[PDB]
Amino acid sequence: REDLDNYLNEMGEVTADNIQTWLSGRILLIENAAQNIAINPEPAAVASLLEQKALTSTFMASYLGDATGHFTIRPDAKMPDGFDPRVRPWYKGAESSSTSTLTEPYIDAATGQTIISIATAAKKAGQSVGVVGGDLSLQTLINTLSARDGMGYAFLVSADGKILVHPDKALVMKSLKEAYPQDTPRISSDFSERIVNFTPIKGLPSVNWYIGLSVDKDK
Numbered sequence: 001r002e003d004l005d006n007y008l009n010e011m012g013e014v015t016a017d018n019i020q021t022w023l024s025g026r027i028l029l030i031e032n033a034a035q036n037i038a039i040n041p042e043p044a045a046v047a048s049l050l051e052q053k054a055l056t057s058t059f060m061a062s063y064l065g066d067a068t069g070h071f072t073i074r075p076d077a078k079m080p081d082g083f084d085p086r087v088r089p090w091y092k093g094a095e096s097s098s099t100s101t102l103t104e105p106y107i108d109a110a111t112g113q114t115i116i117s118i119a120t121a122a123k124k125a126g127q128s129v130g131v132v133g134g135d136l137s138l139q140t141l142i143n144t145l146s147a148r149d150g151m152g153y154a155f156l157v158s159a160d161g162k163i164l165v166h167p168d169k170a171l172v173m174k175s176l177k178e179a180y181p182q183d184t185p186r187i188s189s190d191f192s193e194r195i196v197n198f199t200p201i202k203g204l205p206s207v208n209w210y211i212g213l214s215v216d217k218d219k
């Protein structure tokens with residue numbers, strides 16, 4: 001059973017790695033967008049950047065919000081009345097960070113679907129010209145996880161125990177206590193008890209997140 005715990009520790013690391021790497025490609029595009037927007041933040045120039053295929057193919061949309069509440073999104077969408085970019089999680093998140101950040105799941109203003117955002121402040125000579133973001137669907141994150149690995153299921157949880165991505169969408173943004181109340185596994189311990197183990201995801205900007213592996217205790 002030390003042998004099981006090896007395998008779960010080592011699958012946990014291969015999944016924590018494959019996912020850190022999948023995200024960091026995405027993070028770099030958003031950072032490049034913010035860097036590019038900062039070159040020339042005229043709205044025509046911003047729009048041209050957010051329209052390019054590397055962005056429109058990678059994300060559901062990408063956008064710029066600023067402190068006077070200017071907003072550009074591609075693909076373009078009618079936003080609900082008294083939408084304000086500055087109250088959105090991606091904005092507040094990037095505004096309270098000196099690097100790029102990832103949101104926890106929230107409700108898209110654009111599609112009304114459950115999404116996460118990668119966001120970063122666009123800075124020209126120290127000064128801020130706004131916050132750039134890119135949206136990934138909860139289903140996209142469920143798919144990437146399911147594609148990227150053993151003998152049970154992988155899920156994504158914050159250090160505070162908030163379930164972020166779970167193939168059981170009913171559990172998304174439940175805590176571990178609220179999701180597993182009978183016997184509540186702690187992220188404090190490498191292993192729990194259906195044996196669940198937590199690997200920290202190494203080298204994400206701003207966030208302390210884990211891969212949970214959940215298995216039926218067998219094979």
Ligand SMILES: CC(C)[C@H](N)C(=O)O
Pocket residue numbers: 063073085088089090107108109110115117135
């Ligand atoms: C639409 C976009 C700006 C972002 N997903 C939001 O919900 O605020």
Ligand SMILES: [Cl-]
Pocket residue numbers: 047072073076
């Ligand atoms: Cl526009």
Ligand code: NA
Pocket residue numbers: 021
């Ligand atoms: Na590598």
